Structure formats: structure tokens, C-alpha cells
Design a protein around this ligand. Structure first.
Ligand SMILES: O=P([O-])(O)O[C@H]1O[C@H](COP(=O)(O)O)[C@@H](O)[C@H](O)[C@H]1O
Ligand SMILES: [Ca+2]
Length: 448
């Protein structure tokens, strides 16, 4: 067969049968052969086994004559930032995201933190690793420890006018991942009053593997917001490239609405800019981008397509409904830190609560949320949906699965690139009843 750990966008698998130190070293050797010349940035998340996988990557890279820049325990976005900032040949973040305790993984980038994906080098690496029976060579290059986060912290703070910030009370919930380190380094430079929840990094995860989308994890942030009268709450995944917002009522804000909100925030600083968005949920983003004087650019979902489209368009910002936010000035990469700084600035400057900033948009373009379906036959299931609606003559778009626009409602139906599932998103023009009846109708067809 083929090594299962090599996925479309990254490497992820159970340790040690799908990923281990020998494979990690071989990945380092193979990666050295794929990159242009220069050093390689390495960082890792809070999982207990991550440092040893990084050390194995480093051994293989250095056996292949690559200098290694070890940035230590960090967020994924720090690997992206430092790879670009230091003009490195590439970078690897060792991260397990929210996979089980016996799992780990890696995200790989080349120059300017450009993604390395299945069809842009990752399967080439896999094939090299798979055939590699060579004896491990000894190091012919050095490793440097780079602990300095100054340039990264200065870059994050450059997105806001600090003199306009108000002393908002913010709940912050690292979920025992790595986000609290950066919050604490930012805090001396900000006026906010932080309420720290699950703040200490702990790869044993006494409060569960970080995943703010799980209701029991979500509720911990909501409770802290309500009990402390916080202006809003922020939670992160473990490697903090995803962030999640809770308004002052404790309500979790569906990620779709953050795309339009962040776009308006960014367009106030970069007028007339292009904003890239995914095709799952669109109407609100298109309107909000245009209303702020920007130009919306539809793009297939997935960070590699988004980043490539942003580059070719000089787009200032790109956002996916699933809590991924990309910034041109940040090497076109995603950050879980930039978004909450921008939102804190917008609440501070506008005098409006986060709730008020989104309320009317949520009423105007209500959405189903992404609903996933494991079915026996995805192709036959999609066909059942399309045949059912053919007599309504929707406008069809195939940018990413099938998007069907009926006028007052639309849907997107996609096969995932990360799981063998069908994913449904429905939205309507201000009509909650139509949203529910159409969502349920499609659901019944998919399950038939
Ligand atoms: O989930 P992550 O953080 O690994 O993120 C990855 O998978 C997501 C879901 O993709 P799909 O809907 O095809 O399953 C993508 O939107 C995202 O751009 C990609 O980086
Ligand atoms: Ca993540």
C-alpha cells in the first residue's frame, strides 16, 4: 500500500505504527531534497511526543546538510511566520491538532511559508520516505535555538492602533494548548483585562484535548464569559491557528460571520483590497466585503487554494467559515492571534459589542452550520439531491463540489479533502423557516 499518515494537506497518524522517529528522520531527509537552498525552521506543539519527532526531523535535515532553526514550543503560525521572516527554505510544525493521545503529525511549508501538499511535494516526500532504506548519515549542518519572539509579537501588534484600544475584559481559553504563552507575551502591550481559563500548557490535557467546537469544551468559555461579565471570549485549538469567539452573552459565534466581520476590519486599513472567501457560505461575505469597499474573490475551500488565490490576487485577507483566517502581511498565512486583536480593536473603536457587530448579519443570512453525512455512496447521494431540485432550475457552480443558488436560498454540498464525508451548508435570505425546511429536506435525501 502507501503510508497512511501522508494526507492531502499534512502528515498525521498514530504513533508508532503510522508515524515514529524513524519515519520523521526519513521525512527530514526527503524534505531537504525538495526545498530550495536555505535553513529549515522547526517547531512543535504541547503533545508529549512532539519534541522527539522534531529532534528526528532535525537529525535527518542536518544529515542532509540543512541548517536547522529550532523555534521550540510554539504555535503553527510561528513556524509560518519565522519561515518567512528568516527567509528560510522551509519549515515544519510538529502538531497533533485534536487527534487522539497516541497520534501526532506535521505541517510542512517551503519558502515564504507556501504550503507543501499532496500534489505539491508531500506525496513526493512520501514516496521517497517509502523507498528509503539508506543508513542514517551523520550531521553535516548545525542547529540553532531561536527563542526570540520579538519580531513575531511586533508583527501581531502592528495590526491594531494600540492607542485606540479600550480596557476590555476578555476571557482567553488556551484549552491547555499553547496559546497562553503568546497571550501573556502580548498582555504587557495591551490594556485588556484577561480572564485566563485552562491557561497552562499541559500535553496531558487534564481538561480534554483542545477542541472548542465540542459542546462541553465550548461551554467552559461561555461560562467564564457570563460569570465574569466579559466583553467577549476567545478560545483556541491546541496549536492556536484556529480561534473561536464568544459574545458577551456567552453565545458562540458561528465562524461564517467572522469572515465578513474581519474583512470589514481589514478593509478599513487596506482600502479597495481583495478578500478571498470559500464557496460553502458566501452571501454575507460578498455583501460585507462590498459594503466596506473591497472586492470578494470566490475560491475553492482549503488553505492551499485560498493562499494561492490570495497571492495571485494580492488579496489582503482570506477567510474560511471553519475558523481559518489568512493575512497577506503575515506571509499569506493563517493566524489564530491576528483575528482577536482585530476584533478587540473593532469593539474598542466602534463602541459596539461583538454581539451587535454580528446580530443583524446573522438574521439577514442565517445558515445551517456545516452538517456532515457519512453515507454508503456519496456520488449517488449527491445525485439524489440534484435530481430532486432539478425542476427548480437553480444556478449551479462547481468551484468546490456543487453550489446551487435558488434565489432566496442556496446550498453547497462537498466531499471533504480531509475525511471521506459529505459536508452540507445551507443559507437563506433572512428566512429561518426556509432554512430549516430546506436543510431537513436535503438531509432526508442524503440519508436515503
Ligand atoms: O481542519 P484543519 O485545521 O486541518 O484545516 C484543513 O481542513 C479544513 C477542512 O477541509 P475539508 O472541509 O475538505 O474537510 C480546510 O477548510 C482547511 O483550509 C484545511 O487547512
Ligand atoms: Ca490547529
Amino acid at each position: 500500500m502507501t503510508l497512511p499518515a501522508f494526507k492531502a494537506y499534512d502528515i498525521r497518524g498514530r504513533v508508532p505504527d503510522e508515524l515514529n522517529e524513524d519515519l520523521a528522520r526519513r521525512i527530514g531527509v526527503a524534505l531537504a531534497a525538495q526545498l530550495d537552498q536555505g535553513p529549515v525552521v522547526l517547531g512543535h506543539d504541547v503533545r508529549l511526543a512532539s519534541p522527539a519527532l522534531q529532534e528526528a526531523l532535525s537529525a535527518g535535515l542536518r544529515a542532509s546538510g540543512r541548517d536547522v532553526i529550532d523555534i521550540g514550543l510554539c504555535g503553527t503560525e510561528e513556524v509560518y511566520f519565522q519561515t518567512d521572516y528568516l527567509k528560510a527554505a522551509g519549515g515544519v510544525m510538529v502538531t497533533a491538532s485534536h487527534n487522539p493521545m497516541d497520534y501526532n503529525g506535521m505541517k510542512l511549508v517551503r519558502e515564504q511559508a507556501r504550503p507543501i501538499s499532496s500534489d505539491t511535494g508531500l506525496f513526493a516526500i512520501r514516496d521517497t520516505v517509502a523507498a528509503d532504506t539508506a543508513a542514517p548519515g551523520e550531521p553535516t549542518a548545525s542547529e540553532q535555538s531561536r527563542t526570540d519572539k520579538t519580531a513575531y509579537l511586533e508583527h501581531l501588534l502592528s495590526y491594531v492602533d494600540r492607542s485606540t484600544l479600550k480596557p476590555l475584559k476578555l476571557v482567553v481559553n488556551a484549552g491547555n494548548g499553547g496559546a497562553g504563552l503568546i497571550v501573556d507575551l502580548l498582555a504587557p502591550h495591551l490594556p485588556f483585562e484577561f480572564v485566563r481559563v485552562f491557561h497552562e500548557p499541559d500535553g496531558n490535557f487534564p481538561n480534554g484535548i483542545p477542541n472548542p467546537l465540542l459542546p462541553e469544551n465550548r461551554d467552559a468559555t461561555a461560562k467564564a464569559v457570563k460569570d465574569n461579565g466579559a466583553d467577549f471570549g476567545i478560545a483556541w485549538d491546541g496549536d492556536f491557528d484556529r480561534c473561536f469567539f464568544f459574545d458577551h452573552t456567552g453565545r458562540f459565534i458561528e465562524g461564517y460571520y467572522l469572515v465578513g466581520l474581519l474583512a470589514q476590519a481589514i478593509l478599513a486599513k487596506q482600502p479597495g483590497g481583495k478578500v478571498v472567501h470559500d464557496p460553502r457560505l458566501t452571501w454575507n461575505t460578498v455583501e460585507q466585503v462590498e459594503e466596506a469597499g473591497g472586492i470578494p474573490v470566490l475560491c475553492k475551500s482549503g488553505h492551499a487554494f485560498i493562499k494561492e488565490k490570495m497571492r495571485s490576487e494580492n488579496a489582503v485577507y482570506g477567510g474560511e467559515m471553519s475558523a481559518h483566517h489568512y493575512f497577506r502581511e503575515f506571509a499569506y498565512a493563517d493566524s489564530g492571534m491576528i483575528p482577536w486583536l482585530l476584533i478587540a480593536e473593532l469593539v474598542s473603536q466602534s463602541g459596539r459589542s461583538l454581539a451587535d457587530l454580528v446580530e443583524a448579519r446573522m438574521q439577514k443570512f442565517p445558515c445551517s452550520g456545516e452538517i456532515n453525512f457519512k453515507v454508503a455512496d456519496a456520488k449517488a447521494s449527491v445525485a439524489r439531491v440534484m435530481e430532486h431540485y432539478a425542476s427548480l432550475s437553480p444556478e449551479l457552480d462547481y468551484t468546490d463540489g456543487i453550489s446551487a443558488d435558488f434565489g432566496q436560498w442556496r446550498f453547497n454540498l462537498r466531499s471533504s479533502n480531509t475525511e471521506p464525508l459529505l459536508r452540507l451548508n445551507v443559507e437563506t435570505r433572512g428566512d429561518a423557516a426556509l432554512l430549516e425546511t430546506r436543510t431537513q429536506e436535503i438531509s432526508n435525501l442524503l440519508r436515503g
